[PDB]
């Protein structure tokens, strides 16, 4: 169980470790260090996702670990409340980013092993705080430098903790 | 909280009572009482948005109530999964159709009160089901009359449920 802490709400995030076991770990290990610690959901889409994970205040990519491979084969799809890695074209190039669906984006579920297809490997879902997502969501958004849909009202990522057992079965 | 019944699917909708209060209150009359029940969706753009709430199978237009205010100016943007009333060009003609933005359609925001600037008044949103959406706008359409980019199989509404207690 992973919870981090915004300046608009708690989220608690449960993760699907049989379903995406290296991408949860990875995952889980920029978690416990603090990788995730003072980054901003840099990337706000409304009727969309949020995105976030990789960027600090003022716009500046943080230094990734190595690329994981692309779970999405898990059956998984990106519905309300899932988590899934954002990429680069490449496949299996996700590092450090990743997104909240906040409705069903169905375009973006593994339809095949290609480029439209790859789709987004969803490894985690919202189990408390899917109020704090869709005020998130609602911000006004602009450019900054070279990124687009960047949230004018910072959204930052004070702190991140990880625990153990729960009641989410 | 509102649900539609299609024959492609359910489509689960959050209302904003506050930002809309005349148009919720429109909107909802006609839900509670059965009005939607047995419509289509009569418009059906893709790229743009699909359009519902004024006609059953068959292309026959149903009686409406009388117009209500338009409330664009309520800050609601029509972004992706918003929902916003269909009018006329007159600002204050909304009766009981309504549309889903299946893209950021920014330019049917209330950008001033005139002639291209009234806008469209957002009062809803979809919360669970827009793959139902992203489904209904790949039909395909053609003329019906009177009518344009009319789906050749019927999209039909089969039932609508509204929701008033609590809800997630």
């Given at each position: ?8 709400g708690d989220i608690?995030?449960?993760?699907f470790?049989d379903?995406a076991p290296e991408?949860?770990?990875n995952?889980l290990?920029?978690?416990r260090?603090?990788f995730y ?6 990337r ?6 949020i995105?976030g ?9 943080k230094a990734?670990?190595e690329?994981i ?7 998984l799809?990106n519905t309300?409340?899932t988590?899934?890695?954002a990429?680069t074209?490449?496949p299996?190039s996700?590092?450090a980013?990743?997104?909240?669906n ?11 092993e ?10 985690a879902e919202?189990?408390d705080?899917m109020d ?5 969501k609602?911000?006004?958004?602009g450019?900054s430098g ?7 009202e910072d959204?930052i990522?004070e ?5 153990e057992?729960?009641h989410?079965?």
């Open positions: 169980m992973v919870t981090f802490h915004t300046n608009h608690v995030i449960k993760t470790d379903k991408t949860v770990k995952x290990d920029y978690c260090e603090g610690n003072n980054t901003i959901f840099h706000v889409i409304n009727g969309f996702m995105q994970g990789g960027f600090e205040p003022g716009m500046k990519q990734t670990k690329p491979k692309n779970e999405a084969n898990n059956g799809k309300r409340g988590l899934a890695m990429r074209q490449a299996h996700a590092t980013q990743x997104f909240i906040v409705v069903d984006n169905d375009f973006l579920n593994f339809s095949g290609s480029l439209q297809g790859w789709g987004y490997c969803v490894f919202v189990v705080g704090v997502v869709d005020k998130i609602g911000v006004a958004t450019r070279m990124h687009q849909d960047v949230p004018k959204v990522i702190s991140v903790t990880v625990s057992h729960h989410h079965h």
